[PDB]
Amino acid sequence: LTLEIISAINKLVLGLADVLWDLEQLNIGDVVEAVRG
C-alpha cells in the first residue's frame, strides 16, 4: 500500500503541483517510507 501511495506519486510531484501537495499530506515524498520498506 505504501509503495502504491508510490504509484500515485512522482507524477503528482501551480498550487496543486506544489505547496498543497506536500503541505496537504502534512515528508512522505522526501522519505521515511524507507524505514517501512
**Domains of the chain: which residue ranges?**
2-34
Q: Which helix (DSSP H) or strand (DSSP E) does residue 4 occupy?
A: helix 2-12
C-alpha cell at 14: 501551480
Closest CA to 37 of 11, 13, 4: 4
Do the beta carbons of residue 17 and residue 10 sit within 8 Å?
A: no
> How far lies 7's CA from each of 1, 11, 16, in Å?
9, 9, 17
Position 9, amino acid:
I
